[PDB]
């Protein structure tokens, strides 16, 4: 039995929500599910051998965790980052079970990736790695078996290289991956889906907490990250009349120097930088206009703030940063990143919600579900031999995020207690709602009794 | 060439309708189809070895008759009953060809099952048997090959155990079976579909026979059986304002002691008894309130009656019972059960229709088609990556049953003669309509020339 | 549960040997095997549609009984005869389990065929039927799964058409069938193997019964049948210095009119007749030279006789014929045909052995095993990428038949009682030896416990 | 990157032999192999769900490490022990690469198993677990892909249950596993092979070290373990005229109380105890006759000794025990167990060899190779459709062990230095010989360049 801190972190939060609720008082038989659900159905690791631009034989480790398939084929992204290991991918894959359950679409949970580092690699090297990766993975996936997509380090470029290699090796053209190109079975809204869905979720939070007194307009938002989720979270914020006060990467943070915050052209500039695996610091002009802080996160540096959207990586909000956010005025936190808040930050936010200023955390498995939701929609369009409009997909996305919110608050009211401020735990509601659905389907298919 | 009485019975009725009609005068080439269509495309038998709760090695025989696939993949239920043998399953599978053709959905015909007896078995034993059965069957079925579901003795519990075992063994999540759980690709209305569709069919019969003078409201209905088909036939009858005067099982019959008949809470009580494989006699309270007759069928015991719905098993209405029904006032018979009426009962009812009181039999292959129709709809929802509403499925079901009625009366008028009472044979119309469609598709795919 | 007389006959003889022996006194747990072993692992039936020389759409039923695979892949011949049905093929497939066990080669037991009648068909029609048959069967067989060969009505012509169709459909060249052509993975001695092995077995019988006082030289032999087994039994008899007094077909019997009996040129003439599906009666010259009896079997017509070799079909020796054989001097009977002796004939011969003149029956599952033995050798040569010499295969065949004899007498002495004449039952010894081996392997692989 | 101590231990010893030798001076390009070879080609983990005798849903983790396939299909045993995890199975699978290379047979290296604990389980539970395990593994193995067999906790009973389940699920009868039953493609000598091969290896050690002055006769041997390897090592020792002074299990050690040591009937008694998963302590009579020490290993308790055969598990000889062995007279150590000697014990023995009393360690990857060698021979017999005699297999085994010895000493002389006592390192020679072969084949197939 090995040391898997991130997996254990994610497991402890979920199980804590469940065990602290009335669920096992009402349904004591469900206790039997926990030892079973927490062992993946299957894990694959494989050597990935590839050739660099200098002709050297290179090697990296690849993985696919197929955690749960009670509700559908395994579904979840691929992460290319030098930190990747089994522990991280188990955290993500376990989260993904419950997140996918919340969407209402027929998707099991999985996650995979490699310790391959895209930084410093050419597009040629990345194509070659992608192809080599898929030459290991193809036999273990399929449109009704396991449907990947892109997570950290895995762009449309990578996903599409993988689609191409699968279609060649299996000699079929199907919905094996999502995040595809629009000419090859892609969905409108898929690039935008995660970040748009985070912001949709926040609109439901503001409505509920203010009992309809306020909207997202004029809210000051601190975003971290500068990739797929952060970009479109920032762009949706701006569309909705909110103020984007920060954006960040692994090297530092850009703090807007105007009360109007960052504007769309600036997000597009950063998008172009990240397409070339460059850093925010590499725009001399953005840095001179705004306030660039090498080595820092946004949270303690953004001044007065209303919303925080962690959109980079796990454990990117410390307990100290959570408390600083609240002192700076923050009352809504929604995780674009998977497990963005550290365990200590979760506790700070949950105590605020219960007893303090009422700062309200939406967990990633609810708030960030828009991406995998629109992936499900991509699967549906592929099966239907159809391509829906932007408006059609966005409306479905909005309806899904609303349903996740409603499931979360309904389940929290049924099994939990909100505390002094009467603000239900989105953390507890998402965990319990997702677990109950999966456990029920598991029982039907024979996974436990 | 072996003795297969039930198969021969079912074959003789179908062929009699066809040969007594003008069909082969108009299309003499169709005579060539009969020797071909009546040999199944394929039959599988397999040993099913399993372990009882005492640890003993047990064995039963399993089967899948894949009768015809001109119109689609094989489709039809699985029956667990100690009577099961090849003859019975051929009867059912041959019927199923024509029934499935009538639905208008792309479904071939098949049937399977085992002589395994669920009575006296634990849920644990039933899970184990289900899994063992599917470990024999899986290689011969698939979402575009052969899609089973539940018949006598095969509940959602069994179907879902089988789905789980298939998905594990084939490592894919697809519409391999219908009658699935709502969290795992099930359809709304599927449990209700057969019994609801029987009653829908009867409404068309009353409208036609009374030329719009009467409705189902207030009609006194004798139901046999107490399982999936009988339960929802009884509940639909009550919803429609009819009076349910009986319900039965293999041990006896409950006759209502009030003119109001049985009420929904009583049907639900019986439903709960049957979930535990108990008998009607095991409710002391139901028996004390009503009139329980050990060892009897409803037909001669229900007093005055308007409709008879055989919803248990084949050959459950004798010729003597048919005549007694008519003396008791019965003018509509609709088979929920497959081949519920004995050959002698069919003749009594067809002569009544032609020349007597006008008592009108709807054959199972028309009246009971709602179940496999909604199975087809479940296949469509699975393929579409969609879950339709209850209202949406029920409306489709109603439209299918109406279309089966119209096909039946249209074809009877075209090729047959109704006799003195001008009431077209639903028996003959269903048989000829179904046969013509299948024969036409067979010719296209090369099965005959 | 259907009427399967031939299966029941074969089962009753085997089980009688076992239950009348000490086996279940020594190993009482083996009683549990009988209900399991007697249900085939799998049965396939399929429609076989084909086109005659006049262009008509024709249909026949095909079958493959896969009875037992504890010792190896299913193995056994295909029979084309209008009598064929499931009962007959179950008899043969059940026999084949035990026969294959006796050979010592890794072969399970199965049998298949069709009610297709080769008589009156052209070679063109037979090619077409063969191909159609294999287009149904191919997915259920394979070199390590189920390896057919030719039984009644299935010649090398048929087997090779089937090989060709399999290799095309599966795009591989392997030992899927035995009885192949020498240019396509055939074995030397395979055509001769059954009839040669029968005569080898008889040599062991004469040695044992006469305690080395006599040989096969000069023995007068009555053979029935005129196909693959009879031909080479007759030719081996002649090589060994015995006298062939008869040969027969479905239309009548040729009795030799000389004490020298039939000569090889006459057997070759009949071979050529049977290649064209003609009858013995169609040689005017053979009939004029010898004594042809329309409608008769040899047994009561051959005059004085020492050995009887039933080599046509099941139940071709009545109890009355058995008694007549003994009155005519017969002291050895060896079944070339499967279950050649009727149940009443078996009893006559077993009582003779025990208490009378000492007439000694060798059951087909021992005496006729040479064919499937050399099939196993063909499988070994295919796997090895090798073709052994005639001498090499014949020596292996001889060694196998000797080992079957030794196993039979050793097991009979261990578990049975020979009676007054001290001649062990070859019937009982073969049945018990074969059953013990299969039961032991079944237990190891989990088929029973 | 996780903590994998056993894997790291095994890797460090191998790489130390290689890096301390002249190999990379002669062939510097081989340095590139180490980062590649040490990442498995593939790892599978899977949940194994099963039912205990009380009907409870149980779960365990299963694994198959497919480490290297340059020389053949993956090959190596399955271990059922509550300690099992990925680290242990990687140690074993990495060892297995090199061991399999040394045999000269075309076998890659792998290992798998489960944390399932057979102790306290019924044979029924073990059958059920075995079957469930194989229902997870079957798709990832095959006769030309990955061929398992039995390691700690995996008996013929388990292996054969697994064969049965594979043959059912894949519908083929092939050499998917080795260690099979003799009626189902087993090899003679396979049960005996590991322990016999250890003792064969020791005979070569004595010949070499004493320059032909001494033999194994009369040598006093301390054996640990009491399972498959220990039993047949003890029985071979006795056949060869050596004295068995100990045998042990996880609960304690039996020290012989006579100078004649243990006799074959005593080993057979222990064999029967271990078939029932009982302990040595459970024989009151053995314990009363001899000297039983609860909680102890043999090494410091056996008195004067010449040979030590660790035959239980990894790290079962401490550095202190190694030094005590030498003080007690031990001059030969041969590992029946994989990595039986701790790292500290290896160093004690290698310094003795180099500079001290000349105590000589043979590593498991050489000494214990007889088991997988005879597995390879079982694969060859299966492919050939043949069963070789005991004598034939034992002669091949003896020839393999001699060849492993010769390869080891030849390679040690070529690339290493023996030290003062002129006794070549069997440790270094096995590691380098095995690595060079695998690296060469890897290069040919494109695994590195
Ligand atoms: N994409 C989806 O559909 C989706 C859906 C749900 C949730 N998520 C989650 O959203 C987060 C971001 O994913 P993405 O798709 O936007 O990936 P992305 O496009 O690769 O962007 C990741 C961003 O996070 C930063 N980052 C990554 N790892 C970091 C680390 N260890 N320390 C600090 N900064 C780090 C990167 O910095 P650099 O630019 O300096 O490299 C970059 O700005 C992840 O937690 C992911 O699991 C993604
Ligand atoms: N389910 C479908 O979708 C479907 C569709 C079309 C037609 N059908 C037909 O409808 C009938 C009932 O099926 P079901 O799904 O309702 O099965 P079910 O749930 O198993 O119920 C069967 C009922 O019939 C009784 N029964 C069964 N075999 C009997 C026999 N030999 N003698 C007397 N009573 C017997 C049972 O009595 P106990 O409760 O005492 O056991 C029970 O009340 C069958 O003819 C079936 O083929 C079913
Ligand atoms: N071939 C093998 O390797 C093999 C091995 C072991 C045992 N057997 C058994 O040996 C017997 C003969 O097989 P075979 O391969 O020699 O077949 P074959 O070449 O087709 O010859 C069959 C012979 O038996 C006659 N016959 C068949 N069915 C008959 C019936 N119902 N009534 C009377 N005569 C009948 C045929 O008469 P016509 O010539 O008039 O048609 C013909 O002479 C069978 O019992 C078979 O199962 C065969
Ligand atoms: N079998 C093969 O072909 C083969 C080939 C090469 C090498 N090996 C190696 O040989 C060794 C023994 O394998 P085997 O096949 O003989 O297994 P086995 O039949 O299961 O016997 C294992 C023996 O070792 C003892 N044991 C196991 N784990 C132990 C632990 N953690 N602490 C102390 N004692 C322990 C057991 O004690 P209990 O009886 O108390 O349970 C038993 O006496 C292993 O290292 C294995 O990898 C086996
Ligand atoms: N990266 C994902 C989802 C990938 C997908 O759309 O399957 C996530 O939910 O974190
Ligand atoms: N039990 C069935 C139908 C099963 C199905 O829905 O395929 C029937 O039509 O009798
Ligand atoms: N016809 C056979 C054997 C066919 C074969 O060689 O597999 C028989 O044993 O009856
Ligand atoms: N248990 C094994 C070998 C298993 C096998 O024979 O494949 C070993 O070498 O440790």
**If DSSP states are collapsed to H, E and C, what string results for C367-394?**
HCCHHHHHHHHHHHHHHHCCCCCHHHHH
Residue D132's DSSP bridge partners are none
Do the Cβ atoms of D68 and D75 come closer than 8 Å?
A: no
Chain breaks of chain B after residues with C–N above 2.5 Å: none
Distance between CA atoms of residues A193 and A103, nearest Å: 13
Q: Minimal Cα distance from A4: which residue of D?
A: D2
Q: Which atom of ligand 5 is nearest to the CA of A368?
A: 9
Distance between CA atoms of residues B199 and B216, nearest Å: 9
Return phi, psi of residue D306, to 5°. -115, -35
Which residues in chain B have Cβ-Cβ distances shorter than 8 Å to D51?
A: 124, 128
Do the Cβ atoms of C86 and C96 come closer than 8 Å?
A: no
What single-letter DSSP state applies at residue D313?
A: -
Q: Would you call A78 helix, strand, or coil by DSSP? A: strand
Give the gap in angstroms from C-alpha B165 to the nearest C-alpha of chain A: 8
Strand C243-248 and strand C252-255: pairing? antiparallel
Angle, CA C391 vertex, CA C388 and CA C397 arms, to 5°: 85
Ligand 2: distance of its center to the CA of B79 in Å? 9
Which residues in chain D have Cβ-Cβ distances shorter than 8 Å to B171?
A: 139
Q: Is C13 left (phi over 0), alpha (psi -120 to 50) or beta?
A: alpha
Q: Would you call B306 helix, strand, or coil by DSSP? A: coil
Contacts for C280 with CB less than 8 Å, ≥ 6 apart: C226, C247, C248, C249, C251, C252, C253, C254, C270, C273, C286, C287, C292
Q: Is D386 on the interface with B (CB under 8 A)?
A: no
First-to-last alpha carbon distance for chain B, in angstroms, is 25
Do the Cβ atoms of C297 and C316 come closer than 8 Å?
A: yes
Do the Cβ atoms of A386 and A185 come closer than 8 Å?
A: no
Question: Distance of alpha carbon C104 from its chain centroid, rounded?
Answer: 17
Q: Is D40 on the interface with A (CB under 8 A)?
A: yes
Ligand 3: distance of its center to the CA of D265 in Å? 56
Which of these, B244, B157, B234, B224, lies nearest to B195 by C-alpha position? B234
> Which run of H or E residues covers position A343?
helix A343-355
In the residue annotation, B111 being an active-site residue is answered as yes
Distance between CA atoms of residues D203 and D258, nearest Å: 24
Look up residue A143 and give its two tokens. 């449109």
Distance between CA atoms of residues A407 and A432, nearest Å: 10
Number of C-beta neighbours around residue A33 at 10 A = 21
Q: Which of D90, D99, D111, D396 is catalytic?
A: D111
Distance between CA atoms of residues C49 and C58, nearest Å: 6
Question: Using what technique was this structure determined?
Answer: X-ray
Distance between CA atoms of residues D270 and C419, nearest Å: 44
Distance between CA atoms of residues C408 and C424, nearest Å: 9
Alpha helices in A73-122 (DSSP H): 86-103
Question: Distance of alpha carbon B343 from its chain centroid, rounded?
Answer: 17
Q: With 0-12 CB in 10 A as exposed, 13-18 as middle and 19+ as buried, what is B12?
A: exposed
Give long-range contacts, CB 8 A cutoff, 24+ apart: C429-433: C429/C366, C430/C98, C430/C102, C430/C363, C430/C365, C430/C366, C430/C404, C431/C13, C431/C14, C431/C17, C431/C18, C431/C98, C431/C363, C431/C365, C432/C17, C432/C18, C432/C21, C432/C23, C433/C101, C433/C102, C433/C407, C433/C408
Number of C-beta neighbours around residue C385 at 10 A = 7
Which of these, A361, A449, A425, lies nearest to A20 by C-alpha position? A425
Look up residue B268 and give its two tokens. 């639900």
Contacts for D69 with CB less than 8 Å, ≥ 6 apart: D41, D108
Strand D360-362 and strand D291-294: pairing? unpaired
Count of residues in chain C: 449
Strand C252-255 and strand C291-294: pairing? antiparallel
Do the Cβ atoms of A374 and A232 come closer than 8 Å?
A: no
Q: Do A57 and D32 touch (CB under 8 A)?
A: yes
Q: What Cα–Cα distance (Å) separates residue A424 from each residue in A104, A360, A421, A429, B164?
A: 21, 9, 9, 8, 36
What single-letter DSSP state applies at residue B258?
A: S
First-to-last alpha carbon distance for chain C, in angstroms, is 25
Give the gap in angstroms from C-alpha D189 to the nearest C-alpha of chain A: 35
Give the gap in angstroms from C-alpha D123 to the nearest C-alpha of chain B: 11
- Nearest CA, atom 25, ligand 3: C312
Do the Cβ atoms of B283 and B270 come closer than 8 Å?
A: yes
Give long-range contacts, CB 8 A cutoff, 24+ apart: B208-213: B208/B405, B208/B409, B208/B423, B209/B331, B209/B332, B209/B358, B209/B360, B209/B423
Strand D78-80 and strand D74-75: pairing? unpaired
Distance between CA atoms of residues D37 and D69, nearest Å: 11
Distance between CA atoms of residues A151 and C184, nearest Å: 55
Which of these, B125, B122, B123, lies nearest to B133 by C-alpha position? B125
Contacts for B14 with CB less than 8 Å, ≥ 6 apart: B94, B98, B431, B435
Kindly provide the residue ranges of all beta strands, DSSP E only, lying in C81-167, ordered along the sequence.
Answer: 109-114, 146-147
Ligand nearest to the CA of B108: 6
Q: Would you call C69 helix, strand, or coil by DSSP? A: coil
The percent of chain A in helix, strand and coil, each rounded to the nearest 5, is: 50, 15, 35
Contacts for B339 with CB less than 8 Å, ≥ 6 apart: B6, B9, B10, B13, B91, B95, B314, B315, B364
Look up residue A70 and give its two tokens. 């009670």
Kindly provide the residue ranges of all beta strands, DSSP E only, lying in B17-149, ordered along the sequence.
Answer: 42-51, 57-68, 74-75, 78-80, 109-114, 146-147
Return phi, psi of residue B328, to 5°. -85, 0
Q: Minimal Cα distance from B50: which residue of D?
A: D128
Number of C-beta neighbours around residue A217 at 10 A = 10
Which of these, D187, D183, D174, lies nearest to C439 by C-alpha position? D183
> What's the Rg (C-alpha) of chain A?
21
> What's the Rg (C-alpha) of chain C?
21
Number of C-beta neighbours around residue C146 at 10 A = 26
DSSP string over A199-246:
HHHHHHHHHHHTTTS--STT-EEEE---SHHHHHHHHHHHHTT-EEEE
Q: With 0-12 CB in 10 A as exposed, 13-18 as middle and 19+ as buried, what is D117?
A: middle
First-to-last alpha carbon distance for chain D, in angstroms, is 25
DSSP string over B157-203:
HHHHHHHHHHHHHHT--S-SSSS--TTTT--TTHHHHHHHHHHHHHH
Which of these, D302, D344, D346, D342, lies nearest to D325 by C-alpha position? D302
Strand C220-223 and strand C243-248: pairing? parallel
Q: What Cα–Cα distance (Å) separates residue A105 from each residue in A97, A377, A428, B301?
A: 12, 8, 21, 51
> Which run of H or E residues covers position C243?
strand C243-248
The percent of chain C in helix, strand and coil, each rounded to the nearest 5, is: 50, 15, 35
Distance between CA atoms of residues B118 and B151, nearest Å: 13
Q: Would you call A278 helix, strand, or coil by DSSP? A: coil
Signed CA dihedral, D115, D116, D119, D120: sign only: positive
Q: Do B173 and A447 touch (CB under 8 A)?
A: no
Q: Which atom of ligand 1 is nearest to the CA of A340?
A: 45
Return phi, psi of residue D336, to 5°. -70, -45
> Which run of H or E residues covers position B391?
helix B390-415
Which of these, C102, C56, C61, lies nearest to C84 by C-alpha position? C61
Q: Is C185 left (phi over 0), alpha (psi -120 to 50) or beta?
A: left
- Which of B125, B167, B179 should be substituted to probe chain A, the one whose Cβ sees the most A Cβ atoms within 10 Å? B167
Distance between CA atoms of residues B184 and B175, nearest Å: 10
Q: Do B169 and D169 touch (CB under 8 A)?
A: yes
Do the Cβ atoms of B239 and B256 come closer than 8 Å?
A: no
Q: Minimal Cα distance from C85: which residue of B?
A: B1
Contacts for B128 with CB less than 8 Å, ≥ 6 apart: B50, B51, D51
Looking up tokens 């009699």 gives: B16
Give the gap in angstroms from C-alpha A261 to the nearest C-alpha of chain D: 41
Do the Cβ atoms of B147 and B64 come closer than 8 Å?
A: no
Alpha helices in A20-62 (DSSP H): 23-26, 34-37
Residues with CB under 6 A from ligand 5: A 75-77, 96, 99, 149, 151, 178, 338, 368, 371-372, 375
Look up residue C351 and give its two tokens. 């009582």
Nearest-10 crossing angle of helices D123-137, D156-170 = 40
Distance between CA atoms of residues D238 and A196, nearest Å: 77
Exposure string over D399-423, b if 16+ CB within 10 A, otherwise e: ebbeebbebbbebbebbbeebebeb
Contacts for C75 with CB less than 8 Å, ≥ 6 apart: C96, C100, C107, C108, C109, C110, C146, C147, C148, C149, C372, C375, C376
Do the Cβ atoms of A159 and A179 come closer than 8 Å?
A: yes
Sheet containing C291-294: order of strands:
C291-294, C252-255, C243-248, C220-223, C307-309, C332-334, C360-362
Do the Cβ atoms of D352 and D358 come closer than 8 Å?
A: yes
Return phi, psi of residue B110, to 5°. -155, 175
Number of C-beta neighbours around residue C273 at 10 A = 18
Contacts for C301 with CB less than 8 Å, ≥ 6 apart: C246, C253, C255, C291, C293
Q: Is C142 left (phi over 0), alpha (psi -120 to 50) or beta?
A: left
Sheet containing B360-362: order of strands:
B291-294, B252-255, B243-248, B220-223, B307-309, B332-334, B360-362
Kindly provide the residue ranges of all beta strands, DSSP E only, lying in D251-389, ordered along the sequence.
Answer: 252-255, 291-294, 307-309, 332-334, 360-362
Return phi, psi of residue D304, to 5°. -70, 140
Look up residue C314 and give its two tokens. 């099941």
- Give resolution in angstroms: 1.5
Distance between CA atoms of residues A429 and A412, nearest Å: 4
Q: What Cα–Cα distance (Å) separates residue C80 from each residue in C118, C126, C159, C271, D131?
A: 7, 10, 12, 18, 39
Which residues in chain C have Cβ-Cβ distances shorter than 8 Å to D172?
A: 73, 142, 144-145
Signed CA dihedral, C403, C408, C409, C412: sign only: positive
Contacts for D60 with CB less than 8 Å, ≥ 6 apart: D48, D50, D114, D115, D116, D129
Q: What Cα–Cα distance (Å) separates residue A425 from each residue in A220, A325, A409, A421?
A: 23, 19, 7, 11
Ligand 7: distance of its center to the CA of C112 in Å? 10
Kindly provide the residue ranges of all beta strands, DSSP E only, lying in D38-117, ordered along the sequence.
Answer: 42-51, 57-68, 74-75, 78-80, 109-114
Distance between CA atoms of residues C10 and A235, nearest Å: 81
Exposure string over C182-208, b if 16+ CB within 10 A, otherwise e: eeebbbbbbbbbbbbbbbbbbbbbbee
Return phi, psi of residue D157, to 5°. -50, -45
Distance between CA atoms of residues D234 and D263, nearest Å: 9
Strand D243-248 and strand D252-255: pairing? antiparallel
Out of D3, D35, D59, the one facing A3 most closely (by C-beta) is D3
Residues with CB under 6 A from ligand 6: B 75-77, 96, 99, 149, 151, 178, 338, 368, 371-372, 375
Look up residue C423 and give its two tokens. 């001649």
Signed CA dihedral, C19, C23, C29, C30: sign only: negative
Distance between CA atoms of residues D114 and D135, nearest Å: 14
Strand A146-147 and strand A291-294: pairing? unpaired
> Which run of H or E residues covers position B254?
strand B252-255
Looking up tokens 């004490």 gives: C259
């Amino acid at each position: 039995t090995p040391y898997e801190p991130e997996f254990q972190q994610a497991y402890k939060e979920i199980v804590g929500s469940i065990e602290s609720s009335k669920l096992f008082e009402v349904h004591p038989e469900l206790k039997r599910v926990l030892p079973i659900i927490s062992i993946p159905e299957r894990v694959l690791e494989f050597r990935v051998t590839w050739e660099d631009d200098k002709g050297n034989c290179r090697v990296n480790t690849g993985y696919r965790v197929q955690f749960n398939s009670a509700l559908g084929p395994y579904k979840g992204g691929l992460r290319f980052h030098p930190s990747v290991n089994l522990s991280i991918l188990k955290f993500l894959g376990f989260e993904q079970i419950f997140k996918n359950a919340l969407t209402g679409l027929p998707m099991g949970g999985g996650k995979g990736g490699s310790d391959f580092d895209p930084k410093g690699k050419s597009d040629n090297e990345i194509r070659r790695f992608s192809q080599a990766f898929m030459r290991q993975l193809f036999r273990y996936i399929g449109p009704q078996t396991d449907v990947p997509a892109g997570d950290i380090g895995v762009t449309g470029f990578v996903v599409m290289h993988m689609f191409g290699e699968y279609k060649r090796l299996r000699n079929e053209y199907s919905g094996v991956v999502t995040g595809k190109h629009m000419l090859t079975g892609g969905s409108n809204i898929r690039p935008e889906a995660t970040g748009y869905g985070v912001v949709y979720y926040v609109k439901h939070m503001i409505e509920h907490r203010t009992k309809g007194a306020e909207t997202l307009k004029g809210k000051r938002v601190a975003i971290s990250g500068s990739g797929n989720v952060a970009q479109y979270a920032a762009l949706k914020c701006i569309q909705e009349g909110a103020i984007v006060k920060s954006i960040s990467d692994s090297k530092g943070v850009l703090i807007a120097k105007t009360a109007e915050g960052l504007v769309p052209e600036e997000i597009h500039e950063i998008m172009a930088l990240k397409e070339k695996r460059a850093s925010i610091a590499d725009s001399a002009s953005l840095c001179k206009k705004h306030h660039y802080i090498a080595g820092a996160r946004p949270w303690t540096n953004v001044g007065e703030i209303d919303i925080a959207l962690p959109c980079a990586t796990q454990n990117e909000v410390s307990g100290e940063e959570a408390a600083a956010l609240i002192k700076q005025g923050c009352r809504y936190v929604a995780e674009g990143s998977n497990m963005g808040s550290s365990a200590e930050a979760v506790e700070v936010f949950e105590k605020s919600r219960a007893s303090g200023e009422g700062c309200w955390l939406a967990p990633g498995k609810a708030a960030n579900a828009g991406g995998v939701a629109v992936s499900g929609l991509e699967m549906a369009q592929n099966a239907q031999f159809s391509t829906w409009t932007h408006a059609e997909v966005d409306a479905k996305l909005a309806g899904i995020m609303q349903n996740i919110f409603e499931q979360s608050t309904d389940v929290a009211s049924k099994y939990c207690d909100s505390g002094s401020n009467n603000i239900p735990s989105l953390v507890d509601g998402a965990n319990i709602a997702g677990f109950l659905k999966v456990a029920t389907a598991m029982q039907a298919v024979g996974d436990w009794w």
